[PDB]
Amino acid sequence: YEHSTVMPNVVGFPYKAHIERPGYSPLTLQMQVVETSLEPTLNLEYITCEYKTVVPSPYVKCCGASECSTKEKPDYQCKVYTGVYPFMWGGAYCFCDSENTQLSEAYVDRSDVCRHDHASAYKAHTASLKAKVRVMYGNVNQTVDVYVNGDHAVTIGGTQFIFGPLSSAWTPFDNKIVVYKDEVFNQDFPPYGSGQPGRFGDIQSRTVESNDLYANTALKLARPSPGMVHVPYTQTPSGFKYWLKEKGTALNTKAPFGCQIKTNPVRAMNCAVGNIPVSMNLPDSAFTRIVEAPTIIDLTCTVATCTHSSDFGGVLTLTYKTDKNGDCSVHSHSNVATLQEATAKVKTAGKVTLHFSTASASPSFVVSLCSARATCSASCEPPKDHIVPYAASHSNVVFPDMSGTALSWVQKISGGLGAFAIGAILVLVVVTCIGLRR
Amino acid sequence: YEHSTVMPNVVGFPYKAHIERPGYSPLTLQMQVVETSLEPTLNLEYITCEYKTVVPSPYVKCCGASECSTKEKPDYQCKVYTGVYPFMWGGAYCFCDSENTQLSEAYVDRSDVCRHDHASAYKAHTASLKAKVRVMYGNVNQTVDVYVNGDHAVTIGGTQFIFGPLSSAWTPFDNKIVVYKDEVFNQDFPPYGSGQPGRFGDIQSRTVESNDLYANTALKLARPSPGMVHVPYTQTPSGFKYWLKEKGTALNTKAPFGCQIKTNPVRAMNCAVGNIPVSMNLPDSAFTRIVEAPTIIDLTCTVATCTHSSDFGGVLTLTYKTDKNGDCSVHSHSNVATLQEATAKVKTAGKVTLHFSTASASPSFVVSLCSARATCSASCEPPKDHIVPYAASHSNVVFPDMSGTALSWVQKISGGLGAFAIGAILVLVVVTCIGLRR
Ligand SMILES: *[C@@H]1O[C@H](CO)[C@@H](O[C@@H]2O[C@H](CO)[C@@H](O[C@@H]3O[C@H](CO)[C@@H](O)[C@H](O)[C@@H]3O)[C@H](O)[C@H]2NC(C)=O)[C@H](O)[C@H]1NC(C)=O
Ligand SMILES: *[C@@H]1O[C@H](CO)[C@@H](O[C@@H]2O[C@H](CO)[C@@H](O[C@@H]3O[C@H](CO)[C@@H](O)[C@H](O)[C@@H]3O)[C@H](O)[C@H]2NC(C)=O)[C@H](O)[C@H]1NC(C)=O
Ligand SMILES: *[C@@H]1O[C@H](CO)[C@@H](O[C@@H]2O[C@H](CO)[C@@H](O[C@@H]3O[C@H](CO)[C@@H](O)[C@H](O)[C@@H]3O)[C@H](O)[C@H]2NC(C)=O)[C@H](O)[C@H]1NC(C)=O
Ligand SMILES: *[C@@H]1O[C@H](CO)[C@@H](O[C@@H]2O[C@H](CO)[C@@H](O[C@@H]3O[C@H](CO)[C@@H](O)[C@H](O)[C@@H]3O)[C@H](O)[C@H]2NC(C)=O)[C@H](O)[C@H]1NC(C)=O
């Protein structure tokens, strides 16, 4: 028996579906979303880590000269000075007083611990939703892992379940992403090969193990002081170490809809948005023939107490007359009130109790026990607690019924005004007819 | 010196850009797309391969009964038969005449070579382009590998190049893709866990190493014949073997725009569509001071022969008076004609020759030698060869100049008719003015 439904994408909300086969007693399912996971698709752009400047020892040439040699090193620098007269602890070598040269050399390189501490720059698009649902009906429990898209069928006790694509297409990750350890940032990073010194991305590597490196950190050599051997240099500080202390905010403490961001793999979890269509296919063994089900007649519904609070703040009583004692399925056909239980024990005593949760001043809904029906109306008083540590258990519907107190007053006033207008129109029509018949 | 341009995405087309700095002599670059690659993004769905049926030896219970036991195996079928009386070569065992029992057991499993011969079912989206552009100018000649999007800057001899995103967003891969060896198929495969027996996807595995397996081949057991031990069964043949014989076509021999499809990784190469914006940043050492370059005056452009064919079938001549000899940078400012060379040696003899390729009956373009200018117009005759094995070297513009023979005839006829109409209008105006003056 094929069936379909639409259920909210809220974690912990006890959705109940009612299936009415005409040759069998009604059946009630319960589906709950234990966990979700919004998995995006990532493409690595480059990898940034702190750099490490390498300064080889100077080559002081005594009584001669040396020439600069170019090399293919990241941000390589080389210069030759003239007129150096160095000194050491024992004395001063380079016997020639003035005709000596010193060759300074330096270049940048990736750090030693870059494999353990680096920031990745990604591109995020086309998120894929994956969920873990709990399905319980009849006497079968289970929890399953289902991809939320129209092409994954999972069977739970002979029933084939297909969870349709999510209603919305909203993702909390922008096009460009920077990932560091366990934090995700919505950042716009410079393109590869065009990084600026002192800021994020001064040195960039295509991959952790990639040999190629692009470095732009304004390394500049200076002339050594007289009578010294030190190879002076200057360089703008690391851009990664600066970005560490001035990155600002995150996405963990910034994401909308109250969903946590994690890493490895990057994903946003338990993130309440949209609706999830569901398609089923049940075998004949799930239902019970109508002859076995108890026969219920003369169903009347009364409400003892009501309080439109987050938890189940209502009590329901049903009176009936039965021939045998068995099991019925209880369902509410409107989303203004949600029943706590899905089955009840019908007995010859003719009285059962139910719990429901509502969020309107005056609810009106029809409840069914096995095959019977009954219309319930009640007056609910507001609660007293200001704040509670648990989520809402109702569908958040506030508009009262047309038979409520406020709507009754509105109806009475509008009826009086309409009666006055009708009398006015009748008098005017009578006068016009009398005038025209003259 | 920042510059920007737009160059076609055609392999082998010799695009030349003209950079005219106000303080320096003009420059002509040459860019060429040697190779192109279009890489989609794939998400593996499952793996399919030929199955193998495992039939354990029957358990014949002499003088007794046996009971079937359920197991968690892919497509497990077990049945118990009564009244069997097996036989062997020497004699029949199970002494009891009819109180025997045989237990038939069978189940299906992944084949032995499924790790070597299998087809992957992907989902392809958000293709990314990548090219290999050869850039040559002055004394620079190099080939670079570039990502064709606004986020990769590559330095060629001191100049920064940023190749913008492709103009169009056309990709030849549908949403769903099936890959086999070196062939890509545009196919719609059944969802995981809902495969049908006999067709593609009868057995599905989430990954080649994944332990779980979904199998649905309609394996059914039958009662053994009297006096034999054989465990009969019937099964729908493999779906992979049907698919290999009824897959139909491919994408290698079906893709538009004449672009080859290759596998490992999945990619479409040399696929001519759209335009590639190019951004540049040149240093001041590439140009030459206008004082050093020769001065050109009294430039006349005369066309010797023209034939609007695919190759460079036009010969051009330039006459000039120059003070000193050096190098110039020729260029054509209209895409009607495409020159072959981007540099000519000027001499005191005042005569240089150039080749161009055009595809219109009567072209009209303005050519510039260093800083001079000249307008060229010529009459071209069609070529006789019907088919040639090389691509067109022109921009394929056919509309002739307003000075061409056909448009000259049109202009003359329209002018005659307009003169007639103007004369008639004047006659009518004079007549009506005289009439109104009375
Ligand atoms: C031992 O110490 C003496 C100290 O003078 C060194 O003699 C010096 O040798 C250099 C290299 O041959 C000379 O430089 C040359 O200078 C001329 C100009 O006169 C120039 O044309 C050459 O190209 C070269 O640069 C230097 O003049 C000379 N000293 C003097 C005072 O003339 C000698 O090289 C040392 N030997 C060793 C093994 O250390
Ligand atoms: C379907 O399976 C789930 C999970 O096994 C069942 O939920 C489990 O319900 C039992 C009680 O019926 C829970 O045990 C008790 O939980 C309370 C929670 O405060 C704890 O204080 C007690 O010490 C005791 O452990 C159990 O925790 C709970 N499991 C989970 C994961 O929530 C569910 O009841 C099953 N369906 C049916 C119809 O039984
Ligand atoms: C040697 O051969 C004799 C053949 O007579 C075997 O005796 C057979 O033993 C089995 C033991 O299970 C008897 O089966 C039983 O049959 C009764 C009545 O049908 C049934 O109610 C029980 O549930 C059980 O199935 C079988 O009747 C009996 N054959 C007879 C009495 O003719 C003996 O087991 C053999 N010894 C071996 C194989 O070691
Ligand atoms: C700019 O540099 C490229 C390479 O960096 C030059 O490409 C060269 O192109 C010519 C022909 O287009 C190649 O010569 C060919 O060699 C093969 C070898 O079998 C021969 O069969 C052909 O008939 C032809 O002679 C040459 O190898 C190639 N240079 C390479 C690959 O290094 C290009 O010519 C340069 N630009 C200019 C204006 O010279």
Side-chain angles (χ1 to χ4, degrees):
Chain A
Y1 184 75
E2 192 96 0
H3 198 256
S4 313
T5 186
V6 163
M7 61 156 288
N9 181 16
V10 176
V11 181
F13 187 58
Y15 190 64
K16 309 189 189 307
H18 205 200
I19 302 184
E20 267 177 298
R21 203 146 172 196
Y24 301 87
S25 183
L27 182 66
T28 304
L29 275 79
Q30 314 186 13
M31 300 173 255
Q32 192 168 173
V33 193
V34 174
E35 178 179 358
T36 58
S37 164
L38 191 59
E39 180 72 27
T41 304
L42 303 170
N43 300 76
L44 182 78
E45 285 275 338
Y46 55 79
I47 289 298
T48 316
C49 54
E50 167 155 358
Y51 69 89
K52 166 206 57 173
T53 302
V54 178
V55 191
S57 300
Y59 168 55
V60 183
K61 163 78 166 173
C62 295
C63 306
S66 183
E67 293 83 3
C68 295
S69 178
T70 175
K71 292 170 190 176
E72 311 294 338
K73 302 288 181 65
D75 205 74
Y76 181 86
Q77 290 279 331
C78 165
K79 273 192 72 69
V80 165
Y81 302 106
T82 310
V84 298
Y85 189 58
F87 268 70
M88 271 166 98
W89 64 268
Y93 72 99
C94 285
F95 185 32
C96 296
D97 53 359
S98 71
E99 46 271 16
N100 311 312
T101 63
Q102 176 176 358
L103 194 144
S104 310
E105 199 166 357
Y107 61 102
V108 191
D109 196 359
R110 179 197 291 102
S111 80
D112 288 325
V113 72
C114 184
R115 314 174 319 281
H116 308 165
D117 169 85
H118 59 65
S120 314
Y122 286 114
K123 274 206 180 70
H125 48 59
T126 318
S128 158
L129 182 68
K130 180 197 302 182
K132 168 192 307 297
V133 188
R134 181 208 296 292
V135 174
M136 61 198 315
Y137 67 87
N139 80 317
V140 288
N141 218 357
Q142 281 163 40
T143 304
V144 291
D145 291 331
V146 190
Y147 283 67
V148 178
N149 53 5
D151 64 350
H152 185 186
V154 60
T155 75
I156 301 173
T159 314
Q160 203 187 46
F161 281 98
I162 294 179
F163 289 83
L166 196 61
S167 174
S168 68
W170 164 90
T171 65
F173 305 107
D174 291 331
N175 197 27
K176 286 180 160 184
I177 291 298
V178 169
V179 174
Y180 184 60
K181 292 206 183 323
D182 65 325
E183 281 189 293
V184 175
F185 305 103
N186 277 319
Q187 178 148 352
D188 190 7
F189 44 89
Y192 185 97
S194 173
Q196 288 311 308
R199 300 290 181 182
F200 179 78
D202 43 18
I203 68 165
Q204 294 154 316
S205 171
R206 193 56 90 164
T207 309
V208 187
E209 293 101 8
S210 188
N211 194 27
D212 66 81
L213 189 78
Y214 157 80
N216 180 24
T217 46
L219 172 71
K220 179 179 170 294
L221 291 169
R223 208 205 189 266
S225 298
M228 281 215 87
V229 176
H230 49 306
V231 192
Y233 78 110
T234 179
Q235 190 181 32
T236 291
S238 161
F240 183 61
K241 275 309 172 190
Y242 168 82
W243 173 76
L244 264 189
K245 76 179 61 176
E246 305 256 10
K247 45 194 183 294
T249 75
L251 203 52
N252 302 111
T253 176
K254 214 173 74 181
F257 284 117
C259 63
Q260 300 87 17
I261 310 288
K262 289 176 165 48
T263 307
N264 270 3
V266 179
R267 63 196 186 280
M269 293 177 70
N270 298 318
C271 190
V273 55
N275 287 1
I276 307 166
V278 177
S279 309
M280 323 163 194
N281 180 22
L282 294 94
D284 292 312
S285 70
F287 304 94
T288 63
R289 311 208 72 82
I290 190 167
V291 296
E292 279 59 70
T295 300
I296 304 297
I297 48 184
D298 281 349
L299 204 78
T300 61
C301 169
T302 50
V303 173
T305 50
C306 193
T307 301
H308 60 97
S309 58
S310 289
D311 57 332
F312 294 86
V315 169
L316 197 65
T317 48
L318 296 179
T319 71
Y320 60 88
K321 274 172 211 63
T322 186
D323 53 309
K324 81 175 70 54
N325 47 3
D327 281 330
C328 294
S329 306
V330 185
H331 180 231
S332 178
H333 295 255
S334 179
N335 65 7
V336 61
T338 293
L339 297 162
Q340 185 189 57
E341 55 210 79
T343 62
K345 297 188 217 178
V346 295
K347 277 170 225 169
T348 58
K351 183 170 291 262
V352 304
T353 186
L354 294 154
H355 289 340
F356 75 100
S357 178
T358 187
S360 82
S362 181
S364 179
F365 53 97
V366 54
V367 60
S368 61
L369 180 74
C370 280
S371 289
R373 301 285 184 96
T375 310
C376 311
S377 179
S379 171
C380 311
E381 292 290 323
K384 54 162 271 283
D385 284 330
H386 270 265
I387 288 167
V388 299
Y390 43 74
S393 303
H394 46 64
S395 296
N396 205 312
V397 169
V398 188
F399 209 78
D401 190 36
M402 291 275 178
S403 58
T405 302
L407 277 296
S408 301
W409 277 95
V410 166
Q411 278 194 327
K412 290 173 184 181
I413 295 177
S414 59
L417 296 200
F420 199 42
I422 278 177
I425 291 175
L426 263 192
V427 163
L428 182 64
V429 164
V430 160
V431 174
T432 51
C433 287
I434 278 181
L436 266 179
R437 289 312 160 185
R438 291 162 171 180
Chain B
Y1 187 81
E2 191 96 20
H3 196 263
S4 311
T5 180
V6 166
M7 71 146 288
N9 181 14
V10 174
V11 174
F13 189 65
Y15 188 70
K16 318 195 200 314
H18 197 197
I19 299 187
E20 201 166 349
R21 185 139 171 210
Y24 294 81
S25 182
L27 190 74
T28 312
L29 313 172
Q30 321 191 27
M31 307 183 275
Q32 180 162 347
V33 183
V34 170
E35 181 175 357
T36 304
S37 177
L38 188 56
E39 311 257 357
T41 308
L42 305 169
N43 306 80
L44 180 72
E45 280 279 300
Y46 52 81
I47 296 297
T48 316
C49 64
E50 171 176 359
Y51 67 78
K52 163 202 58 179
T53 300
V54 179
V55 184
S57 298
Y59 168 55
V60 181
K61 167 68 174 171
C62 297
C63 305
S66 188
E67 304 260 18
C68 63
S69 176
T70 178
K71 290 181 185 178
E72 294 293 328
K73 302 278 194 32
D75 199 71
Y76 180 74
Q77 298 272 327
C78 174
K79 268 185 66 68
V80 163
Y81 298 114
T82 70
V84 298
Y85 190 53
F87 262 75
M88 293 209 188
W89 59 272
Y93 83 111
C94 294
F95 194 14
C96 292
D97 189 358
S98 71
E99 311 106 320
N100 296 308
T101 285
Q102 169 171 353
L103 184 143
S104 306
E105 181 156 359
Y107 67 107
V108 76
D109 184 28
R110 184 184 295 111
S111 82
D112 303 333
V113 71
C114 182
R115 174 191 70 280
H116 294 236
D117 173 288
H118 64 88
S120 306
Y122 290 113
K123 315 191 56 152
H125 51 57
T126 305
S128 161
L129 197 70
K130 172 199 145 294
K132 175 193 311 302
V133 176
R134 172 210 296 297
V135 173
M136 41 195 298
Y137 67 88
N139 194 7
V140 173
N141 174 9
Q142 280 158 32
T143 302
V144 289
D145 192 288
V146 182
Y147 281 60
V148 176
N149 58 6
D151 272 29
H152 185 174
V154 59
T155 285
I156 299 172
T159 309
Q160 195 197 43
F161 285 90
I162 293 188
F163 290 86
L166 197 68
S167 171
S168 70
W170 171 93
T171 180
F173 303 106
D174 291 331
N175 191 19
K176 291 180 167 185
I177 283 289
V178 168
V179 170
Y180 181 62
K181 291 211 176 321
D182 64 330
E183 304 204 90
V184 181
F185 293 101
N186 269 321
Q187 187 156 357
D188 189 9
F189 41 79
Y192 180 85
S194 167
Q196 289 303 309
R199 301 282 160 213
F200 179 79
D202 45 359
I203 63 170
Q204 307 165 324
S205 170
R206 195 58 91 163
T207 312
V208 65
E209 311 106 350
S210 193
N211 293 116
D212 60 356
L213 183 69
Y214 161 84
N216 175 24
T217 47
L219 164 67
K220 194 170 72 66
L221 289 170
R223 206 201 189 266
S225 298
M228 291 175 28
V229 190
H230 52 316
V231 176
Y233 72 103
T234 60
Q235 196 186 31
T236 298
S238 175
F240 197 67
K241 286 301 183 184
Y242 278 12
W243 179 78
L244 291 203
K245 205 171 301 153
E246 321 166 79
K247 46 188 184 291
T249 77
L251 202 55
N252 301 114
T253 186
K254 214 174 75 174
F257 293 114
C259 59
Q260 302 105 13
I261 308 288
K262 289 173 164 48
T263 309
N264 189 359
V266 175
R267 56 188 172 179
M269 293 177 70
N270 298 321
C271 191
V273 59
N275 283 3
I276 312 170
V278 182
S279 309
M280 294 182 286
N281 184 18
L282 279 80
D284 291 331
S285 63
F287 309 91
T288 60
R289 289 273 179 185
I290 202 162
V291 186
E292 294 294 328
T295 187
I296 303 301
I297 59 175
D298 285 359
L299 201 81
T300 79
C301 167
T302 58
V303 172
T305 62
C306 193
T307 302
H308 59 108
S309 55
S310 291
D311 58 352
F312 298 93
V315 169
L316 191 149
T317 49
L318 295 166
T319 60
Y320 57 82
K321 274 182 321 293
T322 183
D323 61 357
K324 86 173 73 60
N325 63 186
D327 281 30
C328 274
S329 66
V330 309
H331 182 235
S332 178
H333 302 255
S334 180
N335 66 350
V336 184
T338 291
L339 266 73
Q340 184 182 60
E341 52 260 65
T343 300
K345 293 191 214 178
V346 303
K347 271 166 223 171
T348 62
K351 204 172 301 283
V352 299
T353 185
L354 303 171
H355 303 343
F356 70 100
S357 169
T358 187
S360 86
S362 178
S364 180
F365 51 96
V366 62
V367 71
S368 49
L369 174 78
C370 279
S371 294
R373 296 286 189 97
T375 307
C376 317
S377 180
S379 295
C380 316
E381 291 285 323
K384 287 320 180 79
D385 301 330
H386 275 265
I387 296 169
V388 297
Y390 42 76
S393 302
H394 43 63
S395 278
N396 213 317
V397 57
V398 191
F399 208 84
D401 188 37
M402 282 283 193
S403 171
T405 303
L407 283 194
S408 298
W409 278 92
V410 170
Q411 281 193 337
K412 291 170 184 181
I413 290 178
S414 58
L417 297 203
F420 189 50
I422 278 175
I425 283 289
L426 272 191
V427 161
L428 183 65
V429 158
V430 176
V431 158
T432 187
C433 285
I434 301 299
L436 275 181
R437 281 311 148 189
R438 295 163 174 177

XYZ file of all heavy atoms in Angstrom, chain B residues 67 290 420:
28
model
N 15.144 -28.422 9.960
C 14.436 -27.151 9.981
C 15.309 -26.054 9.387
O 16.512 -25.991 9.653
C 14.028 -26.775 11.407
C 13.180 -27.827 12.101
C 11.704 -27.490 12.086
O 11.294 -26.649 11.258
O 10.954 -28.067 12.900
N 59.564 55.811 -27.230
C 59.184 56.197 -28.583
C 60.326 56.889 -29.311
O 60.352 56.904 -30.545
C 57.923 57.085 -28.556
C 57.211 57.036 -29.907
C 58.278 58.513 -28.203
C 55.782 57.512 -29.859
N 14.892 60.524 -56.963
C 13.563 60.588 -57.569
C 12.508 60.978 -56.539
O 11.654 61.838 -56.794
C 13.217 59.244 -58.211
C 11.968 59.275 -59.040
C 11.779 60.256 -59.997
C 10.977 58.326 -58.856
C 10.628 60.287 -60.760
C 9.824 58.352 -59.614
C 9.650 59.334 -60.568
